Every structure is written in C-alpha cells, then in structure tokens.
Design a protein around this ligand. Structure first.
Ligand code: Q6I
Length: 134
C-alpha cells in the first residue's frame, strides 16, 4: 500500500461552487466557460509504481495526465492552455501547480470523509468541486 491509495478509483462530480469565477480569473472565454461549467466529469485516478495517472472524462473534453511526484511536465489543459505542471503530496493533499504566461494556478485534491474535494485557486478566487465514488 502506498502514497495515494485513498485517491485511487473512479469518482463522479456531485457539486461545484464558483467555477465560472475561477475560469474567468484564469482567462477562459465565454463559450468555453459555459460548456465546461455544464460538464459533470468523471475523474479516474490510478497508480502504477511511481507513476500516477489522472483522467477526466466528460461531454466537454476527455483529458489524461501521467506524472511522477515532484517532476515537472508539460500539460495542455482542457481550455487549451499550454502549462508547466508540478504535482506533489503535502501532508496527504495532492498539490498541482500550473505555470503559464507568468501566471499560476493551484489545484488541491484531498480526501474528506467519503468525498474527494478539489479546490482550484487563481489569485484571490477559489472554486470548490466535490466528487463521490462512482
Ligand atoms: O481536469 C480538469 C477538467 C478536465 C476536463 C473537463 C473539465 Br470541466 C475539467 N481540470 C483540472 C481539475 C480542476 C478543475 S479545472 C480543469 N480544467 C479546466 C480549466 C479551465 C477551464 C475548463 C477546464
């Protein structure tokens, strides 16, 4: 057993707050905000050795990242930003920092009760997205 065992599995979105405002702060345009804000993704997290894979599947976009903790990678986000990403585990929280164009956003994922809680921060704006097991 290991690092991310309590994250592994298939998760479904059950609530979202302030996501449109988070996307505005990130610079996402109107039409993408509308369609992405409507999405109800399933998030699939798996581990194989040191490599963690996170898939997001929805009617809007399907994305996949694979990474090693602490090791930067280039990522194309669902909204088509080209970012440099680093994901670490800090006190049991997966912390995902994305850098692009002199900007930065941080996505934190944590287990709380039977939920996986995702907090997305861009400057002063936070969005909270709650997932349950599928
Ligand atoms: O993995 C997704 C993802 C993938 C496919 C669909 C959707 Br909806 C979300 N993330 C990262 C997790 C935290 C939410 S922000 C985000 N992507 C977006 C960022 C800006 C605008 C639109 C989507």
């Amino acid at each position: 057993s290991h690092m991310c065992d309590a994250f592994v599995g298939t998760w479904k979105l059950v609530s979202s707050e302030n996501f449109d405002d988070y996307m505005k702060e990130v610079g996402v345009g109107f039409a993408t905000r509308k369609v992405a804000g409507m999405a109800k993704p399933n998030m699939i997290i798996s581990v194989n050795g040191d490599v963690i894979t996170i898939k997001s599947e929805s009617t809007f976009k399907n994305t996949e990242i694979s990474f090693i903790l602490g090791q930067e990678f280039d990522e194309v986000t669902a909204d088509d930003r080209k970012v440099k990403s680093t994901i670490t585990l800090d006190g049991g929280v997966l912390v995902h920092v994305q850098k692009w164009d002199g900007k930065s956003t941080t996505i934190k994922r944590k287990r709380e009760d039977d939920k996986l809680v995702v907090e997305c921060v861009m400057k002063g704006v936070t969005s909270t997205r709650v997932y349950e097991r599928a």
